[PDB]
RNA sequence: UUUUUUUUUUU
């Protein structure tokens, strides 16, 4: 049984406020909890309420923005409770419902509560909902603010806790009917903040220069540096290696480790391995290392002050990944990573005035800079109509919502009055953007649903093809073996099929430079998608060698994303470019359909496939007029 | 024409 586990729970700062928070949650229906980093609110508050009997008539739900945090928090809470995982304490995430009729405390992804609230608007199974990591501002969390604010009026018994950063506390309060704010101190350590005197013309080189000084002019302690992209991070490690070699073998070893989402898990694990005696560790990271990945024994942070941010342009149907200055909170999250284990220093390569007057206090929330076609279909399915007037804490741009409503109209998900159609309600069952659900349903009439479920499973995935620095040409040679003459959609089909016919081999993934993590998730998606298809009584049909049927069906959902070769978009005529990764790169194709258009260094079409103009007027008869 | 930060979901 537990020996010293009780001491661990009572050692946490939140234990000093135990009695007071239990009182605050019986007093107030909605409550804001600000808990600084070390507080222990995540693991304890759920248990404090269960211990006070809040579990008697209702279950306790706690949302997390990330899957890994739902499982890790649930596992830790379960050991403190002393019960098997999935009994008294459980977690629910996509493809992993680890709960049983005995579960009184349930940790889940925000996304999961979003999806639950569609089938049960009053969330009858739950007595208490806690939204953890509310400061992250994930679209799901922002949606849950609005829905739960309406749910509280419907059910007076149900209690809601919402977490917040200190700066947004009063904002969140006024949103939630000016309910009270409970503050809980953390255990974090001081961090000395060093601003640059004159701004640095090259942030990459300045960051590398700062890393060398810290390694040679500072006491023992590992370094976390934040850069923006995998290619930039990969290049920085080689440059920093070359520079340390150039200095003698007299100088202490500096161990240079990249960290990014694209990186394989085996390579990711080494950043946690401790530094041999007399060595220093420098992790070169994206913003993945702000919240998502936690690295022990970090005492120095290099903050060049740049992140790659998403921004959606609805008039152009284009995402922008631009390197932009980070928010003040982001800089503070980056700084705080050196004070987690013990006291530390953070080297910001910008002026103090630049931080104070040239940096936004908070990062723009996601709901205000992503395509919302998905979110709006879900809210329509929940029976909400005047979405322009919907009660979002931070309302998204009006043009973005209007284009999302126009896209749902064009797919048949809304009628001329903007009410949800029978088709729309069906498309809302599919956990994907409407355009993909549209294509799955078009694929039944075309006789190609078997291929289309594979293709739609591969659209969801991130970093399908692995491109390591030293073996870039070897990777592209192996990728080209799968190229379909028509383009990227049937290449994804080829890749999934070759993996299946390899016996789902990790070795075959490694030898063909393909991320097994991606193929594994696609398979799990394909199984969930097939179950949804059976439920709506849509047969799974193979088109055999007749792959024109797949391309015809794709026209049903992606007609808006189309271009014609000088490429220019048919809808606006804006110039767009084939991505160098595309199976169509070297190749001629007059008419093209693309999954997504993203401005990095160029306006690049993603997953482009060659199509025939007749299919566009076949698939979308009202959205193409003919003319000589 | 030469390469995308981070994350979420069936009934």
Author numbering: 546 to 1111, 1116 to 1177
What does the paper say about this structure?
A structural analysis revealed that a serine in motif V is involved in polar interactions with one of the ligands in all structurally characterized catalytic states. In the adenosine nucleotide-free but RNA-bound state, the side chain of the serine contacts the U7 phosphate and thereby bridges the gap that is formed by the more distant conformation of the RecA-like domains. In order to verify the central role of this serine, we created alanine, glycine and proline mutants of this residue in Prp22 and characterized their ATPase activity. The lack of the hydroxyl group in Prp22-S837A mainly leads to an increase of kcat regardless of the presence of RNA and only to a minor decrease of Km when RNA is present. In both cases, the catalytic efficiency (kcat/Km) is improved by a factor of ∼1.7. We could furthermore structurally characterize Prp22-S837A in the adenosine nucleotide-free but RNA-bound state, as well as Prp43-S387A and Prp43-S387G in the ATP-bound state. The polar interactions of the hydroxyl group with the RNA phosphate and active site components seem to negatively regulate the turnover rate of DEAH-box ATPases.
DEAH-box adenosine triphosphatases (ATPases) play a crucial role in the spliceosome-mediated excision of pre-mRNA introns. The catalytic activation, the catalysis itself as well as the final disassembly steps are driven by so-called DEAH-box helicases. Two RecA-like domains, referred to as RecA1 and RecA2, build up the helicase core. These domains are divided in three distinct domains, namely the winged-helix (WH), the helix-bundle (HB) and the oligonucleotide-binding (OB) domain.
